Scaffold this motif. Structure first.
Motif, mmCIF file in Angstrom:
data_model
loop_
_atom_site.group_PDB
_atom_site.id
_atom_site.type_symbol
_atom_site.label_atom_id
_atom_site.label_comp_id
_atom_site.label_asym_id
_atom_site.label_seq_id
_atom_site.Cartn_x
_atom_site.Cartn_y
_atom_site.Cartn_z
ATOM 1 N N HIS A 1 42.844 65.576 49.890
ATOM 2 C CA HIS A 1 43.769 66.171 49.042
ATOM 3 C C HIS A 1 43.658 67.085 47.606
ATOM 4 O O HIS A 1 44.201 68.692 47.075
ATOM 5 N N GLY B 1 40.624 63.784 56.558
ATOM 6 C CA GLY B 1 41.863 62.794 56.285
ATOM 7 C C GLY B 1 42.442 62.818 55.186
ATOM 8 O O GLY B 1 43.968 63.035 55.701
ATOM 9 N N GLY B 2 42.054 62.214 54.104
ATOM 10 C CA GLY B 2 42.904 63.343 52.476
ATOM 11 C C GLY B 2 42.657 64.179 52.148
ATOM 12 O O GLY B 2 43.214 65.479 52.519
ATOM 13 N N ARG C 1 43.717 65.411 60.410
ATOM 14 C CA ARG C 1 44.686 66.517 59.726
ATOM 15 C C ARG C 1 44.385 67.545 59.433
ATOM 16 O O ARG C 1 45.407 68.866 59.212
ATOM 17 N N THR D 1 36.888 53.928 47.833
ATOM 18 C CA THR D 1 37.957 54.866 48.667
ATOM 19 C C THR D 1 37.633 55.054 50.627
ATOM 20 O O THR D 1 38.336 56.176 50.582
ATOM 21 N N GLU D 2 36.836 53.779 50.645
ATOM 22 C CA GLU D 2 37.104 53.803 51.961
ATOM 23 C C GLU D 2 36.500 52.448 52.599
ATOM 24 O O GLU D 2 36.136 52.057 51.783
#
Ligand SMILES: Cc1cc2nc3c(=O)[nH]c(=O)nc-3n(C[C@H](O)[C@H](O)[C@H](O)COP(=O)(O)O)c2cc1C
Ligand SMILES: Cc1cc2nc3c(=O)[nH]c(=O)nc-3n(C[C@H](O)[C@H](O)[C@H](O)COP(=O)(O)O)c2cc1C
Lengths: 122, 122
Positions: free
Chosen positions: B52, B49-50, B108, A121-122
């Motif tokens: 979601h 960042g993600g 974000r 994931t990174e």
């Protein structure tokens, strides 16, 4: 089987997180990178001291999620990486799975995670 | 407010884990010890960042769990410690909470966790 980068992470100390489904929501417990014992590249063994609520949760829903990482291993956008592991959990108090973590005297059982997927994931 | 040992952990790098409730089951994501910012002692801010699926889960249920730790900090019975944090989460795209992590240009939004309880689990 688990990728080489996964094992690279294990060469470094860190905090491992293990999520289960509780009755009032998710539950989250930990272990250490240095404690994990991987068997034949597809099963992860964790030494269980407490994890009583966790064991209860697994008995109702065996699905678990586990994350771990290290800022010392290169990821895909520079230094630092980690993984999201999805699998089914089971507790053992004997067998080669228990022996894998039997070194830990405070261990009452072994949490065995049969890996279904591993995502960097990174 | 958060305890002394918690802030000590924050001064050492490590993998932070955040669990949320999905419609299918639990979800688990991460951030780095060094990325965390605490505002007014009881609000932990995470650069997003993600996250979601995480954001979607929080919209359905704001209750989240967070674990973090460090082998470099003295634990209850030896070197190494960590915490289980329980709190309510909210995503912010503006305001002082967002500004708290604005340094991260890739952010974000800001995931703010208002801590309800903190437990030293090791
Ligand atoms: C960094 C860290 C490592 C831990 N390692 C273990 C471990 O290897 N085995 C264990 O049983 N508990 C370990 N714990 C404690 C668990 O996270 C959990 O608090 C405890 O087992 C109780 O589990 P339960 O809430 O499922 O009853 C660790 C905690 C931290 C913060
Ligand atoms: C060690 C490590 C640190 C991470 N740090 C962050 C972070 O600071 N912010 C972020 O948005 N995602 C971070 N991620 C990625 C998240 O864990 C997650 O995979 C991603 O944000 C997607 O979230 P979602 O599955 O909720 O959609 C990190 C992953 C790892 C392995």
């Amino acid at each position: 089987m688990l990728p080489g980068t996964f094992f690279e992470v294990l060469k470094n100390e860190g905090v491992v997180a293990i999520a289960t489904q509780g009755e009032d929501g998710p539950h989250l417990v930990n272990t250490w990178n240095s404690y994990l014992k991987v068997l034949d590249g597809n099963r992860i063994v964790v030494p269980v001291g407490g994890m009583h609520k966790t064991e209860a949760n697994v008995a109702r829903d065996e699905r678990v999620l586990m994350t771990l990482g290290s800022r010392k291993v290169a990821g895909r956008n520079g230094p630092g990486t980690g993984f999201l592991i999805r699998g089914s959990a089971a507790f053992r108090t004997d067998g080669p799975e228990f022996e894998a973590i039997a070194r830990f005297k405070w261990a009452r059982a072994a949490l065995v995670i049969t890996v279904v997927s591993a995502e960097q994931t990174e």
